[PDB]
From a paper:
In order to reveal the atomic-level details of co-translational folding, we determined the structures of a series of nascent model peptide with increasing amino acid length. For this study, we chose the human [name] Trp-Trp domain (WW domain), which consists of 35 residues, as our model peptide. The topology of the WW domain composed of three strands and two beta-hairpins, which form an antiparallel beta-sheet. The structures of the intermediate-length (WW11-MBP, WW17-MBP, WW19-MBP) and full-length (WW35-MBP) WW domains, which are fused with MBP at their C-termini, were determined with X-ray crystallography.
On the other hand, WW35 (full-length) has a three-stranded beta-sheet structure, as previously reported for the X-ray structure of the full-length WW domain15. The three-stranded beta sheet-conformation of WW35 is correctly reproduced by the method. In WW35, the loop arises through an interaction between the backbone amide N of Ser16 and the carbonyl O of Arg21. Consequently, the hydrogen bond networks of the intermediate-length WWX are distinctly different from that of WW35. WW31 and WW35 have beta-stranded conformations. Additionally, in the case of WW35, the circular dichroism spectrum is not affected by the concentration of TFE. The conformation of WW35 is more tolerant to guanidine hydrochloride than that of WW31 based on the tryptophan fluorescence spectroscopy. Therefore, the folding of the nascent WW domain is eventually stabilized after translation of the full-length domain.
Author numbering: 1 to 402
């Protein structure tokens, strides 16, 4: 019989003589034993579909060829919503891949095991990536790659990309004279509009530690209002459409219909085959200030209820987080600037990667506070409601902030 995951208490129902389980962290109650659900002797991995999951699977076969231990890569939709649901019952994948921002929430709920890399392995990764996966003093995941949004532009349509958001409206005008658009990017996910929204740090940026104040002052401030108003105004003046998602933006750029998009390194792959001559460069400034994308560190956390933690450790440390492991993933979909020093040193020669790190260091590594999931949803609603005209910018942001 396996040991119980953190927070779990085993109990007896006096009325039926039936054992049940109660979790003091999540208040979850159930008849099935939380441990013992995840199958032992194999590795099941969840990663997002836009990532190099097929490349990750190659590392999985390499692991199986060497060890006999099967590795299974799955990419469900909304895995960031599904993992906490199942793992809170003791079920789910052994390893979950996602940006670090959601791991703090997972960690507080007792869903992620503390990882145990020794000092020698820690030296192999940049310390700032270990910081992204530290929750309440504990390392709760293996950092993989640094994800910063960059301005991606068509070199043929636009040899000299705009340095400011402000000059885009007029640029869109003279590109419409060509039957083109200046800029199209996913307006449905707050991840993509945030760099503009946070740009102006006049009201909510903390110079004490270089962090945007999302919990005290919050998104209801004049700086965020200016950013979202500029966004809405591009839409009213018809330089952007409120309905543009990832799919639409991607297609239009890779068909050369628009001069610019905003996206991460995972997107480079599809552009490469489209053979648009593209550049990856710094995001435009707004109000004299650099855009501040929330930077994600794609991380691999281990399920607290998993019986394969040492399997997971071996796989992540000695197969994935190597030069040949990351390359296998990187060739499938570009990871961005990796956490592994030795591999990143080769990638840093790539100007696209230099551009990624440049936007990263102008932006901010996301907080991993438990509230991140609520924050993202609040901002998303505000943007969507402001952009559709359903609310004004003040109202949208007032309601967003609580
Ligand atoms: O839009 C909110 C969303 O932003 C981030 O998600 C990114 C993710 O980090 C990237 O790896 C890529 O998959 O695009 C996502 C945006 O669609 C946050 O990590 C996520 O928690 C948040 O919901």
């Amino acid at each position: 019989m396996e040991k119980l995951p953190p927070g779990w208490e085993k109990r007896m129902s006096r009325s039926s003589g039936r054992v049940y389980y109660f979790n003091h962290i999540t208040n979850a109650s159930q008849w099935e034993r939380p441990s013992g659900k995840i199958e032992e002797g194999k590795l099941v991995i969840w990663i997002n579909g836009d990532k190099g999951y097929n490349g990750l699977a190659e590392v999985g076969k390499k692991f199986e060829k060497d060890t006999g231990i099967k590795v299974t890569v799955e990419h469900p939709d909304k895995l960031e919503e599904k993992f906490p649901q199942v793992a809170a019952t003791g079920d789910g994948p052994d390893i979950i891949f996602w940006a670090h921002d959601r791991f703090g929430g997972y960690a507080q709920s007792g869903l992620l095991a503390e990882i145990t890399p020794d000092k020698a392995f820690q030296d192999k990764l940049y310390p700032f990536t270990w910081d992204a996966v530290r929750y309440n003093g504990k390392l709760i995941a293996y950092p993989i790659a640094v994800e910063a949004l960059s301005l991606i532009y068509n070199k043929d349509l636009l040899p000299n990309p705009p340095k400011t958001w402000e000059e885009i409206p007029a640029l869109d005008k003279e590109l419409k004279a060509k039957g083109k658009s200046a800029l199209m990017f996913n307006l449905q996910e707050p991840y993509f509009t945030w760099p503009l929204i946070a740009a102006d740090g006049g009201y909510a940026f903390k110079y004490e530690n270089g962090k945007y104040d999302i919990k005290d002052v919050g998104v209801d401030n004049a700086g965020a209002k200016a950013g979202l108003t500029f966004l809405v105004d591009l839409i009213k003046n018809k330089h952007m459409n409120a309905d543009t998602d990832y799919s639409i933006a991607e297609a239009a750029f890779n068909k050369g219909e628009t001069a610019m998009t905003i996206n991460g390194p995972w997107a480079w792959s599809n552009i490469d085959t489209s053979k648009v001559n593209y550049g990856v460069t710094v995001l435009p400034t707004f109000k004299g200030q650099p855009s501040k994308p929330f930077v994600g560190v794609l991380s691999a956390g281990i399920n607290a209820a998993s019986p394969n933690k040492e399997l997971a450790k071996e796989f992540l440390e000695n197969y994935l987080l190597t030069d040949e492991g990351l390359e296998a993933v990187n060739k499938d979909k570009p990871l961005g600037a990796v956490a592994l020093k030795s591999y990143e040193e080769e990638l840093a020669k790539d100007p696209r990667i230099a551009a990624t790190m440049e936007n990263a260091q102008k932006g901010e590594i996301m907080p991993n506070i438990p509230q991140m999931s609520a924050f993202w949803y609040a901002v998303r609603t505000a943007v969507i409601n402001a952009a559709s005209g359903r609310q004004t910018v003040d109202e949208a942001l007032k309601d967003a902030q609580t």
